[PDB]
Design a binder for this molecule. Structure first.
Ligand code: CA
Ligand code: CA
Ligand code: CA
Lengths: 212, 212, 214
């Protein structure tokens, strides 16, 4: 019987939760495509919810002046930019793709949080206008974009917003996207709008993509 | 496996292939495999290999449901209405969701029948006018509707039609939707058109959704 | 699993991952897992790790297929006398079982690709040398309710590997098409619709290449 060890992975964390109810939240190995056990992925299992959470690698975009107004994709367009990747970096992309496809099928929903660190850079709401027209965008895995407004199937939610004014200091805004259409996740890129001025800087902490 | 609760099969088609001696009946299957605890109870047709899952409740009682012509969704709009639900109402809705998702996305084909019980209510053909303009509609599981006419991908077929006149008596019309795109099934709602008058009544018997 | 009939692998990519010493060739795989008995014999490209399933039948004979008495695309399978849609896998297995094995590969692979060859006599396949344009290019039917074309939405355009059909010369030639995608439910190709057909001197045939999943 699977037990979530590297040599004996479970199919996902929900299976571990139910078939091994004594296990606590933490690091486990899961193998959504089953078959060959060697392409298993290392995850965090939330044993309260049954969520399988896969970390981004790299987890973070360092705080820097990145760009010198329009939305600009970090991965697509910025110098030193990269798109976000998930799961054991040593695994071929196609294998990671297949694992995510199976985990999507195994799950009712997926969610992900992302943190925008800001210095003189609006992320969501602009305190002066009270509007979100300068809000950043996120790119999903199905080419779709997650936005502040527009099609309600694709809008993100904001959990805290410390970036509403240029204060010369660092703060942060936290975004979440949650959906039943798990093909849309994980987030692969980010496009700030209020960037490019000499004293504007940002960083990013990419939260894990969680499936249940 | 063998189709018992302790040893469920992936689905009925596998059970037929691997155990051709088994007769049609109740079995336990586990489309998402892995941990066996979320296996579901189904009817296996062992001649076709179909996995058939019953609605629960499967019956809409015969009643005057609507008072007021236009299509009106039973589940969406009528007092006491409900959308049709499938599987062991014991398991959480999200578990059944995933098990059904495996069947909907990875089956060859699917089919489902639904029976409209009618008193003074046209269901498909209107004998007096000679047309199907008053025909009812059905709602699938992929935000699509099944109709008497229009896009031939989404038309249902009528197996018997006893609802063609207002006679003051009870009769029935039987609808089927069959598709190689099983994401479209099961049926989740019904919209009669010829309803609302003081002597008009209907009921429904929801047939099982069957996956190959 | 080792890719034998009694011990089929899930697919060729798993076989490669677990057995780097295995060479390209035929093996038994079982994408739907569960019962082992409905395993399918495939070609594994062990350089890429692709699972390749051959068309059966793989050939549309070379013939005058269509009589034009009207000019538009005409689907071979849907409209032509003796036409058929393309099927894949061991015809010893039930159609529904093959569909399911294919469905696992289509939904859950990273990528898919397929080539198809149009044999032509007095029949433009893609480029029309006389006009210099692709207005007469044939179309292909995918497995997800879409079509693959010379132009339009770039997600659904095919690519042309060689094009020998650009003139009417009274001689046989061929044009080879390929469709590659990260949305594998679009494949395999199930039908073909030539445009430059139906004239009294026009003929075509088709060789359907294997559908390959990663
Ligand atoms: Ca595996
Ligand atoms: Ca299970
Ligand atoms: Ca099998």
């Amino acid at each position: 019987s699977p037990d979530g060890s590297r040599k004996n992975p479970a199919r996902n964390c929900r299976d571990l939760k139910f078939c091994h109810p004594e296990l606590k939240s933490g690091e486990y190995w899961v193998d959504p495509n089953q078959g060959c056990k060697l392409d298993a992925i290392k995850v965090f299992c939330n044993m309260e919810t049954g969520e399988t959470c896969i970390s981004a690698n790299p987890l973070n975009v360092p705080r820097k002046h990145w760009w010198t107004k329009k939305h600009v994709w970090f991965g697509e367009s910025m110098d030193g930019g990269f798109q976000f990747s998930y799961g054991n970096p040593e695994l071929p992309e196609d294998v990671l793709d297949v694992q995510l496809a199976f985990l999507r099928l195994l799950s009712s929903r997926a969610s992900q949080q992302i943190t925008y660190h800001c210095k003189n850079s609006i992320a969501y709401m602009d305190q002066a206008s009270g509007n979100v027209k300068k809000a950043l965008k996120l790119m999903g895995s199905n080419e779709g974009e997650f936005k502040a407004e527009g099609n309600s199937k694709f809008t993100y939610t904001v959990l805290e917003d410390g970036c509403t004014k240029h204060t010369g200091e660092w703060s942060k805004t936290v975004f979440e996207y949650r959906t039943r259409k798990a093909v849309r996740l994980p987030i692969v890129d980010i496009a700030p709008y209020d960037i490019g001025g000499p004293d504007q800087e940002f960083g990013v902490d990419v939260g894990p993509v969680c499936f249940l």
